[PDB]
Design a protein around this motif. Structure first.
Motif, PDB file in Angstrom:
ATOM      1  N   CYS A  52       0.787  -1.266  -0.058  1.00 15.58           N
ATOM      2  CA  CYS A  52       0.079   0.190  -0.161  1.00 15.58           C
ATOM      3  C   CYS A  52       0.984   1.208   0.059  1.00 15.58           C
ATOM      4  N   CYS A  87      -0.672   3.385   3.397  1.00 14.63           N
ATOM      5  CA  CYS A  87      -0.275   2.792   4.956  1.00 14.63           C
ATOM      6  C   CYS A  87       0.927   1.975   4.938  1.00 14.63           C
ATOM      7  N   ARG A 137       1.041  -1.516   4.411  1.00 15.73           N
ATOM      8  CA  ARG A 137       0.646  -2.801   4.573  1.00 15.73           C
ATOM      9  C   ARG A 137       0.943  -3.771   3.294  1.00 15.73           C
ATOM     10  N   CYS A 166      -6.701  -3.512   0.766  1.00 19.34           N
ATOM     11  CA  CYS A 166      -6.376  -3.214   1.846  1.00 19.34           C
ATOM     12  C   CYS A 166      -7.603  -2.872   2.607  1.00 19.34           C
ATOM     13  N   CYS A 217      -6.774   1.477   4.624  1.00 18.26           N
ATOM     14  CA  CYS A 217      -6.993   2.597   3.686  1.00 18.26           C
ATOM     15  C   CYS A 217      -8.150   2.647   2.724  1.00 18.26           C
TER      16      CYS A 217
HETATM   17 ZN   LIG Z   1      -3.442  -0.279   3.079  1.00 15.55          ZN
END
Ligand SMILES: [Zn+2]
Ligand SMILES: [Zn+2]
Ligand SMILES: [Zn+2]
Ligand SMILES: [Zn+2]
Ligand SMILES: [Zn+2]
Ligand SMILES: [Zn+2]
Lengths: 692, 692
Positions: free
Chosen positions: A109, A112, A114, A122, A125
């Motif tokens: 991402c 963020c 992740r 995700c 976000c």
């Molecule tokens: Zn994310």
């Protein structure tokens, strides 16, 4: 299994017949201007390219050519082209990188940081990401290119503020392999990238799915390393490469492509390359040949002579004295041939002798302080004045950038009042010791027929003066400016002194034909009526340097300049030859003769970048003699050279390295060639130890 | 010694792997739309051309290709190009003619007609002539081109009044060899020129000096004759040639050039060629291969199948059902293969049966009086109405010119009120017996995505009507025009119903990408909410003909047209496919289905020019059935065909000849195929005798 050429009459070829074996490493060598370049490029390359393109270049003057195949010529003719091509795209490794990143690239991402596993998005976000595709990473498609710079990485120049030159939108840059995204991988040096891909840790499924792509990437990077370019970066723009780097990149790409049944014509691939890379280059050439291709190499290197299957020698002289085939066969047969210059130099009958005494600095030095342009590591360099200095080093060590863009530009700005931007350096002390700077290269001396060697050397003014001094001119009231084609009054009115006319056809490019009124003599009929010692202006211009040497023996001032032109080996050329038709070597020799003619004041500096380009061994000997004469005249000569024959005669050597790219930029050794040879950790010293 | 393709996924290819032997005569065959053309041209030709051009086409979807060489594709894609190219210049015989005329051409005077021997000028007319050079006869240089037309031979079109199309100034035309100048030699037919050069009488010196040029000219003319083009003239403009003639001229030029180590890809070279020339064409193909080249021939001829070294079969069906490699090997192996359509037709399991009863004329005839366009020798032709008629003859016999430019244009002007200029003929009687004329060819049915087979056949209106008849549409007040993307109200506003967008890059051509708002569905979200029998407009458009046949079984009117589309073998295609992506065969089949759907009034005439182009044997069988159905409907069909399978089923045959060029233009035989076979002096009759 042969290539048969009958009645080749291109340029100065003397209607020769040659049989070139197919699928072999064939080397064409000879003196500069002997017609080897004509025979190769203008005949074989032209015919091979035409016979393929027309089924989808001018027709050479030849009876017939048999056993031909499509021909690809690789030479030092790099062009800026487009900003959409880089090293990775040219070598076709970026496509495999995109495929690998689509296959095993780990999504991420950009908001963020992740990881996304699979909805394929995700949950934090609330950002949706589509399935990864190879076209997503390409900057030549709307799906991946950064929108501000449409994938160019710069704005028409400044870097794009959004992607910072990454050429890709922030969504694509989130996918990382082994902790690095695609741009960071492309920012590594080629050797670094090969090492990074060699020890990559992968799962069983990843290894199964990405075996072939990894194999292809490793093979292509190995080809690039073997060509001798392990310091370049995959993200470097192809526009900024030098001629030799571009030629070697093209060679590596051709090796990696796997094309077979093609004739390759190479124009001195070893130029701009250190001596330590000759073995690698020769092995790469042999690998390219082993695919089922024929190699025609126009090279003057001794190692290339010894590593070839067949050698074709042209001569015996140059220009009107060349155009024949003096000798041919293997290297041993060439050495045994009594009437071959290449064999004469290989067998040791003729050689360049190492000087017994070398000049010494007189306490006047030019010091560069804080040179840090490109990859130079903030070094200080001292260049002695009044001696012959050679700048040596491996490829990519920054010698060219340092010398050119920190010395020539600065000296031009300081002395000639030029307006250029020098490189990143603090200051230079010792400028007051010089009066003028001159740079000699292979660029043409003019773009118009109005400029010829006679006018460039300044001897044409003396010729016109002595012509106007004749009895007929005095009786007719003719002035010295009458015999000049650059002003109205003596030149032909139809062609304005050019001697040629332009005729436009409806569906053809403009064609230049000789003027009918003056028959190409560029002079009026009345002016041609004046004859000095039985010759008029047209015959004087048509006369060659060798003939003019005997013709103007009585006049000392003209004889001095004619002898100066003859000493640089331009005795075969004629005074009236247009500067458009001159080659790089001819232009360089004309410039050298002009510099020799001028009365030097002892406060001039000459800068030469690879002067031994396209020069035979005898040509190298003559050039070394000329440079030593220029130095003994009282000036300073700085030469960037990779040739050991030139290097061993220099009075001072500055070695840069110890490697290329970011690994270089330092000073390794300095001093006389013996002192440099004493240095253990220097490739130039190691080779000089054996040479001496 | 092999070409290895792994993971070819271009278009409809089902990720296949193939090994093509090198330096052999390899034939790729299969049903139309099975992907053979994709596999050859889009993969192998594209990669081979790209790998050579990039070192001076889009990259195919393939893992890797090995053992490749530069590729040359020869197809029927002739272009007008330039008026400066003729047959002689294209085949590179004009250059040798210029050389021969420079060598042994006899000079003459253009004012008195005397002979000049050597001053090199005449003493009577006081006209000075320079020495004869090869460049003097060229019309692409200022030295020889006629000044009024700068060598074009015409004024932008009318012939140049000065040279009368000779393209050369009067000075050059005075030099004659054997009583004919260069233009008069170029005006002869190729066979006539070969005979003229064969029995040329020359002196000993002339024979010595012009042996090689004569040998080369004779060899090239022999190649042209062997290709099957002994009726053309060397002075004919290359723009006016047909597709087959241009393809064969390119083949002869490639044979004569002598290039080796090249992959040649041929797109049905035998099309537009009489059956008697098949042996000559095959021998020429073998001669081209023997130079050291690989041949990939996409051909459906039986003789080509039997004369090949390796056969690659694709199928089993077409479109989504094709893209595989059903069988491969030699011809015997293909015949023994149970799951090969080509083997099934070769072995005799499936064949086209000769009809036992043939239709007869009903007393209504269309007579052409005084047809004399081009090489027609002022003939009268009677074409019966209401039956299936085939026009047969050798190449260049004038059948195409007669049929097209004396029948189609005249009928269009008389009935459709078209504004065209017919050919040179007196009159046509019998026009009142017809009501309309239609010409079916392989031209595209549209140039925009707005046109698809569903709209072309007219079934889209019925589909929209039944969609608007649904309960949801009635409740929402939706009209029938709402479900059409050609008007505002139902289509997507962003793409205006096209479903695609245009994005322009700074240094790239315009790129078309699917529209993001409608995802390429070309309809608004509100309109897509209406579902008929569980399917909306997008799924209906995406449905293929086979699926739509079962889907619309309840509705009879739609089912009739869907079955009509399915009967022409277009069951693999989808209703929503844009007309831009359709090929020639698909467009022709769409047109045939549209004609079958319409309620014929029994007074229509259909004209087809080589309908069996790119059609397999099964495709030919289906086309024969469709044409017979159209005839039985009550109309008249006229077909210009060279295929014996189609010919043997016709109810009437008109044969033109007996030769090509100026040797033809007459009527040889007419009547039923048996009557034509009874005629001894007719090639078509001779072949029909064996076929029947
Ligand atoms: Zn994310
Ligand atoms: Zn950007
Ligand atoms: Zn003139
Ligand atoms: Zn005369
Ligand atoms: Zn004319
Ligand atoms: Zn849209």
């Amino acid at each position: 299994d042969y290539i048969v050429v009958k009645g080749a009459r291109e340029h100065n070829l003397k209607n020769i017949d040659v049989k070139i074996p197919r699928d072999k490493f064939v080397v064409i060598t000879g003196l500069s201007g002997s017609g080897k370049s004509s025979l190769a490029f203008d005949t074989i390359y032209a015919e091979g390219q035409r016979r393929y393109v027309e089924s989808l270049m001018e027709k050479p003057d030849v009876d017939y050519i048999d056993g031909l195949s499509p021909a690809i010529a690789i030479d030092q003719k790099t062009t800026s082209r487009n900003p959409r091509s880089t090293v990775g795209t040219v070598t076709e490794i970026y496509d495999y990188l995109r495929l690998l990143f689509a296959r095993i690239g780990t999504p991420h991402c950009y908001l963020c940081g992740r990881e996304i596993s699979q909805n394929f998005a995700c949950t934090e976000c609330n950002v949706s990401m589509e399935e990864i595709t190879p076209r997503m990473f390409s900057f030549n498609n709307p799906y991946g290119a950064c929108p501000e710079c449409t994938g160019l990485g710069s704005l028409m120049n400044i870097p794009c503020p959004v992607c910072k030159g990454a050429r890709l939108k922030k969504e694509s840059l989130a996918v990382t392999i082994g902790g690095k995204n695609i741009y960071e991988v492309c920012c590594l040096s080629i050797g670094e990238a090969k090492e990074f891909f060699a020890n990559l840790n992968l799962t069983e499924r990843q290894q199964l799915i990405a075996r072939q792509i990894l194999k292809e990437i490793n093979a292509r990077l190995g080809f690039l390393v073997d060509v001798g370019l392990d310091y370049l970066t995959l993200a470097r723009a192809a526009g900024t490469l030098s001629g030799g780097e571009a030629q070697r990149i093209r060679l590596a790409t051709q090796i990696g492509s796997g094309l077979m049944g093609v004739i390759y014509i190479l124009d001195e691939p070893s130029i701009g390359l250190h001596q330590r890379d000759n073995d690698r280059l020769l092995r790469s050439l042999k690998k390219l040949r082993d695919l089922g291709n024929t190699l025609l190499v126009v090279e003057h290197d001794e190692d290339t002579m010894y590593a070839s299957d067949y050698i074709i020698d042209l001569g015996p002289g140059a220009g009107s004295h060349g155009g024949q085939i003096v000798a041919e066969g293997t290297v041993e047969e060439i050495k045994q041939n009594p009437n071959s210059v290449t064999g004469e130099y290989l067998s040791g009958r003729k050689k360049i002798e190492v000087p017994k005494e070398r000049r010494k600095p007189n306490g006047k030095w030019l010091e560069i302080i804080g040179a840090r342009e490109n990859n130079l590591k903030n070094i200080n360099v001292r260049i002695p004045l009044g001696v012959f200095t050679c700048i040596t080093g491996v490829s990519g060590s920054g010698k060219s950038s340092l010398i050119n863009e920190i010395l020539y530009k600065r000296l031009a700005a300081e002395l000639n009042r030029a307006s250029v931007k020098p490189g990143e350096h603090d200051l230079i002390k010792g400028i007051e010791y010089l009066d003028k700077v001159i740079d000699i290269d292979q660029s043409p001396i003019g773009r118009t027929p109005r400029s010829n060697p006679a006018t460039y050397t300044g001897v044409f003014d003396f010729i016109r003066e002595i012509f106007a001094n004749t009895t007929e001119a005095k009786t007719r009231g003719y002035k010295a400016g009458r015999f000049s084609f650059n002003v109205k009054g003596g030149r032909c009115e139809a062609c304005a002194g050019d001697g040629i006319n332009k005729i436009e056809m409806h569906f053809l490019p403009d064609i230049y034909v000789p003027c009918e009124v003056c028959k190409g003599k560029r002079y009026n009929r009345e002016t041609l009526e004046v004859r000095y010692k039985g010759k008029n202006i047209a015959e004087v211009l048509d006369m060659t340097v060798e003939e003019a040497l005997e013709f103007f023996k009585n006049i000392p001032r003209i004889h001095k300049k004619i002898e100066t032109l003859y000493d640089v080996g331009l005795g075969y050329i004629k005074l009236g030859q247009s500067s458009t038709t001159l080659s790089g070597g001819e232009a360089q020799r004309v410039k050298l003769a002009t510099e020799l003619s001028r009365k030097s004041t002892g406060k001039t500096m000459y800068i030469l970048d690879e002067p031994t380009t396209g020069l035979h061994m005898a040509d190298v000997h003559r050039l070394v003699g000329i440079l030593h004469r220029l130095v003994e005249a009282g000036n300073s000569v700085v030469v960037i050279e990779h040739n050991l024959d030139v290097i061993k005669t220099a009075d001072y050597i500055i070695d840069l390295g110890p490697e290329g790219g970011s690994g270089g930029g330092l000073v390794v050794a300095e001093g006389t060639p013996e002192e440099v040879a004493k240095v253990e950790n220097s490739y130039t010293g190691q080779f000089l130890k054996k040479v001496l």
